[PDB]
Amino acid sequence: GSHSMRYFHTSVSRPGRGEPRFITVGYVDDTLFVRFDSDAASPREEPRAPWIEQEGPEYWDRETQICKAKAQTDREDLRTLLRYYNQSEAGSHTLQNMYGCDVGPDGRLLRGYHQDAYDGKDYIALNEDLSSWTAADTAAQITQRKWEAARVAEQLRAYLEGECVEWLRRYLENGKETLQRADPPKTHVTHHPISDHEATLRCWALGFYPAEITLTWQRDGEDQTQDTELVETRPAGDRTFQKWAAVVVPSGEEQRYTCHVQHEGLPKPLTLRWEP
């Protein structure tokens, strides 16, 4: 189907407590597969999915080199950003970067990404053309000018169109047992009284992969969006996800309510009701 690969990076300065903490993880779709944490003893990038473990020692050596260089680049960049925002060296600040690519079912590039944020806000982002930039403020315009002079967009475009897609396709083949398997949600409806007059109907979806899912409650066939409590989809810890949606219904009208489940793992969408 469609698929993605992303590398996420965070540096957090901690003045008076040594160098910034640096953590990066890589994902294919919703599957974590590599990690690097600067505060580990002798830090190396480590595998987190079985299908990456077969990469040879040269692969881990080059990945670790990249992780360490990015940490060091972030350390300098955090000092730069203190100048650009006229900030003190006393406080803790955050630099985040994400990049990666999306491919379609034929394995063709759909979209590439590379974006940076400072202290939780947009700083500078490569546009979807992979050739121009969006700078969020006059500080990021300085970076933009530097990155235009240096033709950074062209270098990123070459990676996103080439290696990014090539390697994602390799990962997809090598982990096809799990990466190309959708686990449908296991579903049920629970009923919990809140008084003599109403009760919560809660529609559960457990054990599913990938995380994308739609849960909706209807009453007599009409969506209950404004009446529906819907928790963020959350990780089970074993690669799969969980979600639920709830509505408060008048006691005795439970059979008017249906829960609708759409998931890539499902033959067809499900319709569930509370079953006493």
Binding site: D77, I124, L156, Y159
Partner: peptide, 9 residues
Amino acid sequence: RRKWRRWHL
């Protein structure tokens, strides 16, 4: 696999 970052802010 990763892309080496060769640029500064």
